[PDB]
Every structure is written in C-alpha cells, then in structure tokens.
C-alpha cells in the first residue's frame, strides 16, 4: 500500500510521492488532495 500523498508506479513497482507530480499538469487522481 501507499499513503494519501503517494501513488504506486507499476514500472518501478514502488510508491512514488505526489510532490514529484505536483510540478506536472496532469498528476494521478489521488494527488489532487495533496497538490
């Protein structure tokens, strides 16, 4: 499992923080609450 600030990248097969996707313009769905 991951946190509410993390998402699970199936390639790395690990939890990736949302802070890396906040600088994006189309982060995952669960990072809306974080970013």
């Amino acid at each position: 499992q991951c946190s509410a600030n993390e998402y699970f990248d199936s390639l790395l097969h690990a939890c990736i923080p949302c802070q890396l996707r906040c600088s994006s313009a189309t982060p995952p769905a669960t990072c809306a609450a974080y970013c």
Partner: antibody
Framework: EVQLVESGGGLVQPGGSLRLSCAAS????????MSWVRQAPGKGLVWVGE????????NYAPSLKDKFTISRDNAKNTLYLQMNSLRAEDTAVYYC?????????????WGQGTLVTVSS | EIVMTQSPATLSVSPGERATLSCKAS??????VAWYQQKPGQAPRALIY???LRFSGIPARFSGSGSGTEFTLTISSLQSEDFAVYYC?????????FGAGTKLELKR
C-alpha cells in the same frame, strides 16, 4: 558495484530448451522486482516478464506464454529464465533488468545481455 | 496488445540543437509511459518513468511529457554522448509494449 552478469545462452535448434542465469552482486537483489527483455538482431525491444520479490506473483507475456518460466533464488541473489520449445523467431539478446524506487530516486540496472540463437 | 508508434524513425540533428520525439499509443495509457536510451552494444538506459519524472543521474536537458496517447521526449541541447536510439514504453496494461525506435544521428 552493482553487477548483473548473465551466464548461459548459446545455440539451439527449434523446439529445444535452455536455462539462463542472471547473477546479481552489488545491490539488494532480494528486495526489488526483476524483469527479462529480449531484442532481436537489429530490432526493437520486446518485454518478457517480471517476478515479485518473494516469487508470489509472476507476470509473463501472452505471445510467449507457456514458453518461458521465470524463477529467482534470492539466497544466491540470481534470476533464472527457463526457456522451452524455441524457434528461430525467438532469436534475440536477453537482458535482465531491475527497476525500483529506494533512496527517493528511480534506479535501473541492466545486465550485459547474453545471446540465444535458435536455428537448425 | 497496445501499440506504441514512434515518429520520426530517424532524426538528423547537430549538437546544441533540440530534439522532440513522439510516441503515439493505440489506447489511453494515462501518465504511465517510460523512456529508454540504448547505444550500439550497451543495454538500455532508462530516462523517464512517470512520463515526466527522470531517473537518477539523468541530465535536466532530457524532458519527458505527454499524457493519455500522445507522448514526447525533448532534449533541450544535444551533447555528443546523447546521439543514440530512443525507445518508449507503456505500463498501463500488461504486456508492457515498447516503441518502434527513434535513432538520432550527428548532422555534420
């Protein structure tokens, strides 16, 4: 030094079998996912399969389903690839990679790659 | 399987200039596209993993972007060491399907 030395792999005729070893020394082999990928002579990459750390969830590829069995002996820190009923259309170089996300940075380590040529 | 289509198959460019590749997908794979560089003889070398997130030791000139089905990889300024093949990959649906390939050449 992270190292992925891949032994085994030579020449075989259509329908033969072959086991490949991917010895890992230099990183926590027993804690990350492992994957195999082939690339035919002068052609693009072609995924094969991955395997969970504790061998609790293996993922193969449809086209090669039933053809390649994947295993791993964490004790010897090494990844195996059992090949069955091959064909000249299966000829390619076989790498063994490993992608994870520890230390806050995305890593990736590829082996030398060993060639497997199928032909009569 | 899903089809990743890379265009152009070959891009001629000189050091210093930029390069923008493309990787079209058969179906919406969302922000789940990686990028790999491979040189003649050496194994592949990862560059981007979550469409825009780079790997470790990857310079900043390498920039990935795109979501859904249209993806690209920008190389703001080409060094000598950056002229090689560039593949793309999707991991939104097994089997993980690679791209066709975009090989750069040093124009002289």
């Amino acid at each position: 030094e992270v190292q992925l030395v891949e032994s085994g792999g030579g020449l075989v005729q259509p329908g033969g079998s072959l086991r490949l070893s991917c010895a890992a020394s230099g990183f926590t082999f027993s804690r990350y996912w492992m994957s195999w990928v082939r690339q035919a002579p002068g052609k693009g990459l072609v995924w094969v399969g991955e395997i969970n750390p504790d061998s609790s969830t293996i993922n193969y590829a449809p086209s090669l389903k039933d053809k390649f069995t994947i295993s791993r002996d964490n004790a010897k820190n090494t990844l195996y690839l059992q090949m069955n009923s091959l064909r000249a259309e299966d000829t390619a170089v076989y790498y063994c990679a490993s992608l994870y996300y520890d230390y806050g940075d995305a890593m990736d380590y590829w082996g030398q790659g060993t060639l497997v040529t199928v032909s009569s | 399987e899903i089809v990743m289509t890379q265009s152009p198959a070959t891009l001629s460019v000189s050091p210093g200039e930029r390069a923008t590749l493309s990787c079209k997908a058969s179906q919406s794979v969302d922000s789940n596209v990686a990028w790999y560089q491979q040189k003649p003889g050496q194994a592949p070398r990862a560059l981007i993993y979550s469409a825009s997130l780079r790997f470790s030791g990857i310079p900043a000139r390498f920039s990935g972007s795109g979501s859904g089905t249209e993806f690209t990889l920008t190389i703001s300024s080409l060094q000598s060491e950056d002229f090689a093949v560039y593949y793309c990959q999707q991991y939104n649906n097994y089997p993980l399907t690679f791209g066709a390939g975009t090989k750069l050449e040093l124009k002289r």
